[PDB]
Amino acid sequence: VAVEEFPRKLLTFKEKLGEGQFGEVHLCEVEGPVLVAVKMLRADANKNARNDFLKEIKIMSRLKDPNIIHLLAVCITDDPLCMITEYMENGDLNQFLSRHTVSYTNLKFMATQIASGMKYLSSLNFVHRDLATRNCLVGKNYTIKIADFGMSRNLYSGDYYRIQGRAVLPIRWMSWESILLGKFTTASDVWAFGVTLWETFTFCQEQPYSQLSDEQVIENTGEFFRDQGRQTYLPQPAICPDSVYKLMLSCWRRDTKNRPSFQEIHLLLLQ
Numbered sequence: 001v002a003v004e005e006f007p008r009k010l011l012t013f014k015e016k017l018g019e020g021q022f023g024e025v026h027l028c029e030v031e032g033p034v035l036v037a038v039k040m041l042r043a044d045a046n047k048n049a050r051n052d053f054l055k056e057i058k059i060m061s062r063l064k065d066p067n068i069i070h071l072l073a074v075c076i077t078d079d080p081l082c083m084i085t086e087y088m089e090n091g092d093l094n095q096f097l098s099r100h101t102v103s104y105t106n107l108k109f110m111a112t113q114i115a116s117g118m119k120y121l122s123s124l125n126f127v128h129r130d131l132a133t134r135n136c137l138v139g140k141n142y143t144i145k146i147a148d149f150g151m152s153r154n155l156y157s158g159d160y161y162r163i164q165g166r167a168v169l170p171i172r173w174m175s176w177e178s179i180l181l182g183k184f185t186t187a188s189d190v191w192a193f194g195v196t197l198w199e200t201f202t203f204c205q206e207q208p209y210s211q212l213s214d215e216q217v218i219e220n221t222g223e224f225f226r227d228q229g230r231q232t233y234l235p236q237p238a239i240c241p242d243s244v245y246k247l248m249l250s251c252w253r254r255d256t257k258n259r260p261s262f263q264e265i266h267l268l269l270l271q
């Protein structure tokens with residue numbers, strides 16, 4: 001699998017969109033107003049951070065859904081390395097919904113767009129592992145594209161926690177079995193989608209399980225896996241009609257064989 005090489009000379013840097021530990025992301029304007037996002041790899045990158053970038057290119061070149069971030073081109077004839085995507089002028093869904101009320105048809109539409117992305121990824125057996133409104137990108141006319149910024153962003157540092165032997169994980173979105181056992185399946189992504197839908201219908205005004213703190217979020221994960229009534233669920237949003245709340249509670253059932261598939265979730269949301 002291959003991609004096209006984009007003439008770097010025609011890019012014109014405008015703003016910085018973000019920073020990882022091992023690259024930048026720039027909003028540029030192409031000369032031949034046309035703007036692209038450029039994920040770069042810093043010229044001074046160790047073997048591991050450069051090979052992971054090449055692996056990132058190989059995996060991104062295969063992603064071909066209009067709700068997943070999509071690779072337009074690369075710069076790899078010489079350093080710095082680059083990947084290109086269409087600019088989304090409304091930022092991440094957390095930032096966009098927090099700015100607002102918006103039509104319920106638009107919210108439900110954005111949730112269906114996420115579900116279509118997630119069903120694509122599930123069809124590739126690509127478990128995304130960090131779905132959240134912070135990880136969605138929003139463009140013209142309320143369109144969505146699932147992305148993956150990594151845990152680097154300072155703005156969302158409070159959405160993440162590190163278990164004593166485990167790496168940092170966004171525990172508030174995760175299902176018990178991605179916490180207690182480390183098994184990230186598409187079911188765990190479906191539990192993620194439940195929390196993400198909840199953020200969409202609350203306008204992300206507050207962090208889920210806002211009443212709790214982290215060690216109580218972990219003890220509550222134990223209350224899910226214990227399945228003895230002491231688990232506490234995300235409350236039903238007022239904007240959210242009862243049936244999509246029943247889709248959400250279906251995402252959060254203790255056993256994965258009873259959670260919905262992304263294909264069925266997409267079908268159900270469209271009514």
Ligand SMILES: O=C(CN1C(=O)C2(CCN(C(=O)c3cnc4[nH]ncc4c3)CC2)c2c1ccc(F)c2F)NCC(F)(F)F
Pocket residue numbers: 017018025037038039060063068069070083084085086087088089091092128137146147148149
């Ligand atoms: O897409 C991926 C990983 N990935 C990304 O998340 C990003 C870099 C991190 N993000 C950005 O910097 C950003 C912020 N705000 C933006 N406003 N407008 C465009 C734009 C961009 C999002 C886009 C990205 C990636 C890869 C190549 C890119 F060229 C690129 F831009 N993985 C697929 C999976 F579904 F799993 F998410």
